[PDB]
């Protein structure tokens, strides 16, 4: 019933279809390089979904870290370990899949049964655009311990990966 809310809807469903299709491509395709590039596609589509939900900083950060850094790291680690993917099948190759599928499917239905049953609190107020100054205030008012402590998390992760992949 409008043009400005219609573009949001069409863009949302397009991005969601892209996300689902590319994640299924990540998971089902036998070749893994295609899966890595489609994973990058998933990350871009999710970063485009966040912008509809009034989160721009985190969207740019997802585009800057996951696809920018982590996905490149995966594209290195994958050719580190490519040897023509010579894998012989197991007899139960279908069995496990089936189990996972039904299990996974149940969870979805279960989660869906929640998502449509519970009375969410829609809180009709226009959100705030300045979603970057506020995060700055929260890093030093409310959520300061995670800031100060993710510092040493990153230190420890560097110290770990540097001494677990070292060639000696």
């Amino acid at each position: 019933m409008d043009l400005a809310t219609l573009t949001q809807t069409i863009t949302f469903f397009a991005l969601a279809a892209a996300v689902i299709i590319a994640a299924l491509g990540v998971v089902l395709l036998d070749n893994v390089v295609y899966s890595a590039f489609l994973l990058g596609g998933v990350f871009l589509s999710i970063a485009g979904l966040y912008i509809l939900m009034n989160a721009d900083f985190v969207s740019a950060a997802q585009i800057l870290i996951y696809v920018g850094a982590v996905n490149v790291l995966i594209l290195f680690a994958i050719m580190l370990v490519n040897k023509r993917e010579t894998y012989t099948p197991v007899p139960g190759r279908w069995l496990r899949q089936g189990g996972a599928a039904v299990v996974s499917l149940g969870v979805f239905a279960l989660l869906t049964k929640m998502i449509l049953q519970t009375p969410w609190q829609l809180s009709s107020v226009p959100p705030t655009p300045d979603s970057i100054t506020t995060i700055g205030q929260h890093f030093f008012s409310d959520f300061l311990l995670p800031f100060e402590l993710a510092s040493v998390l990153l230190l420890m992760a560097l110290i770990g990966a540097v001494v677990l992949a070292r060639r000696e």
């Binding site: 870290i65 490149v72 290195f76 655009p129 970057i132 030093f140 990153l154 560097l158 540097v162």
Partner: protein, 114 residues
Amino acid sequence: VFVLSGYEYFLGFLIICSLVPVLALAASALLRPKSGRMIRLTTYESGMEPIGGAWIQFNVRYYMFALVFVIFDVETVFLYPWAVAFHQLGLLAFIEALIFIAILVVALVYAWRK
């Protein structure tokens, strides 16, 4: 609800910029020779043919830099709103952020000494 005001150009421009490659490239197949597929498909190894086997002798010389990049690139995302709110914050958040930066520098020195 959409409060970002400054988009509705990002979308269309993502569309038109995703449409220049596919269109300048589709305006080539309409006018170009076709395929010539016998020996023009071979791989350029400086005139000679490739040896065979064709491996790479992998190395960490390009992995470790991506690792430390992931670290120091996650780090920067904690600094943009700091810089942008530095007007509102003032003191006791500079003292509290140079801790973050000093521990980062310790990580940098660790990676540097190796």
